[PDB]
Design a protein around this ligand. Structure first.
Ligand SMILES: CCCCCCCCO[C@@H]1O[C@H](CO)[C@@H](O)[C@H](O)[C@H]1O
Ligand SMILES: CC(C)C[C@H](N)C(=O)O
Ligand code: NA
Length: 492
């Protein structure tokens, strides 16, 4: 079985798992919609009461399973809870990352295609001295709409450009070239290059954005809006719903990806300090880097109220239309846009390999496929299924809700219950702390066993016909994966 080569490479690979497209596209929108600073306090609390303990739990479950040759949750749940229903629940740890990848790699290809076009200067050229922002936003809006082929009429049909489709082919090929080299020579080797690159690009963009100023505002105004606490909105449950959901999304928790990565950590190697360092690096890249780019740039040009209204228009609109349009009003702004989309591409690529590895690990561990065949069959499934996302409008929305939103939160609660309630709280705690360079504070034993599951349960309770096409297909994917698990059990 493969193993990570270096402790640093393991850290950077896990950091790249978490630091992805959602950290930079979705997190600023969610922070701005919920009052900025009024969102950061619950998010930080959700980082301490949900993100940190669930990260340690997934690290421990992964290393525990990998010790017996199993990297995915159908087998790992059954090891922790010897029950046929544990295998059925474990299927979600393959279905969630696969379905997410079926649209995630497509969005990743957007950022690559935009990086190419912005580097060569093939971008919309708004007329100078524009006294109206719409005359600048509209060329970039039509630019994205032509790239992905937004429907012009009532038919929910997307029409991707030829360039967008070719770039999606290249993007799949790049993911395959990394994954086919394996854990150490592929994912780990790429992480050691991509994470320093990602960090340097983000720091540069933060500095450049921080210098932005118009008569409508400054970047410091946006930072003040994002970091000034508002204790009145602590009463609102919706802020906690958004904060805990963002904790799942930014940390790649509940996607089965952390577990599979941790399955290549050796039996004796640390997971406490290593996991804490990976999660801390991700939060630095999320709240400090990602949150300090697009929202402060928007506030600098539009003011807080208009920037919030812009953020309500969605992650795609802010990331692919509004931010490049704002950049186009500055010297060297086309090159600044290229850096933004190159940052997004490396963040996406380090995350998409992470959510495609669970299916690869299942085929290797349980069906005994070679790495080459496992990676190629996984890529074929993702590439084929992605045509539903590329051509059917709102198919991505349905996949992102059922697998990317409902699925990840329920799966995080499920894995915690299996590990800390069914398998055994004391046994789980000793397995988490075994071989650690530092020990988890004893207070977290009662956070994992009582506070975290009660937190998730309470918040979950407080929480067109074409949609059935996507539902019918992802339900079929689940049935397909259940059949593969069935075939594995008949061979074992
Ligand atoms: C399972 C259904 C198979 C359908 C194969 C569709 C392959 C995509 O087809 C391509 O898509 C592009 C637009 O997106 C066009 O630019 C190309 O001309 C077209 O060949
Ligand atoms: C692996 C991905 C589905 C999630 C990742 N944390 C991101 O920000 O994109
Ligand atoms: Na990433």
């Amino acid at each position: 079985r493969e193993h990570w080569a270096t402790r640093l490479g393991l850290i950077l690979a896990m950091a790249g798992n978490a630091v992805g497209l959602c950290n930079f596209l979705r997190f600023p929108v969610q922070a701005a919609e919920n009052g900025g600073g009024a969102f950061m306090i619950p998010y930080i609390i959700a980082f301490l009461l949900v993100g940190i303990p669930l990260m340690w739990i997934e690290w421990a479950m992964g290393r525990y399973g990998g010790a017996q040759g199993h990297g995915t949750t159908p087998a790992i749940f059954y090891l922790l809870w010897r029950n046929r229903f544990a295998k059925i629940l474990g299927v979600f740890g393959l279905w969630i990352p696969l379905v997410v990848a079926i649209y995630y790699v497509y969005i990743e290809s957007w950022t690559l295609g935009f990086a190419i076009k912005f580097l060569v200067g093939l971008v919309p050229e708004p007329p100078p001295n524009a006294t109206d922002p719409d005359s600048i936003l509209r060329p970039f809006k039509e630019f994205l709409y032509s790239y992905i082929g937004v429907p012009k009429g009532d038919e929910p049909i997307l029409k991707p450009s030829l360039f967008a489709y070719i770039v999606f082919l290249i993007t799949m090929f790049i993911n395959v070239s990394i994954l086919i080299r394996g854990i150490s020579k592929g994912i780990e080797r790429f992480a050691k290059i991509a994470m320093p690159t990602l960090f340097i690009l983000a720091v540069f963009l933060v500095i450049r954005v921080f210098l932005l100023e118009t008569p409508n505002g400054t970047a410091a105004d946006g930072l003040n809006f994002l970091w000034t606490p508002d204790f009145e909105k602590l009463k609102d449950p919706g802020v906690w719903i958004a904060a805990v959901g963002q904790i799942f999304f930014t940390l790649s928790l509940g996607f089965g990806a952390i577990i599979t990565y941790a399955s290549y950590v050796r039996k004796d190697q640390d997971i406490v300090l290593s996991g804490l360092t990976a999660a801390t690096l991700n939060e630095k890249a999320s709240v400090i880097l990602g949150g300090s780019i697009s929202i402060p740039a928007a506030v600098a040009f539009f003011g807080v109220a208009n920037a919030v209204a812009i953020a309500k228009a969605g992650a795609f609109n802010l990331g692919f239309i509004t931010l490049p349009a704002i950049f186009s009003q500055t010297a060297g702004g086309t090159f600044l846009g290229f850096l933004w989309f190159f940052l997004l591409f490396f963040a996406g690529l380090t995350s998409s390999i992470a959510i495609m590895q669970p299916m690869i690990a299942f085929l290797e561990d349980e069906l005994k496929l070679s790495r080459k065949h496992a990676v190629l069959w996984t890529a074929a499934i993702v590439f084929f299924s992605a045509h539903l996302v590329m051509f059917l409008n709102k198919s991505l929305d349905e996949m992102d809700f059922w697998a990317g939103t409902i699925g990840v939160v329920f799966f995080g609660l499920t894995e915690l219950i299996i590990f800390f309630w069914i398998f055994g709280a004391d046994k789980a705690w000793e397995e988490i702390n075994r071989g650690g360079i530092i020990k988890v504070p004893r207070i977290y034993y009662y956070v994992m066993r009582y506070i975290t599951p009660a937190f998730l349960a309470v918040l979950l309770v407080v929480w067109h016909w074409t949609v059935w096409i996507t539902r019918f297909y992802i339900i079929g994917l689940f049935l397909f994966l259940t059949f593969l698990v069935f075939l594995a059990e008949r061979r074992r």
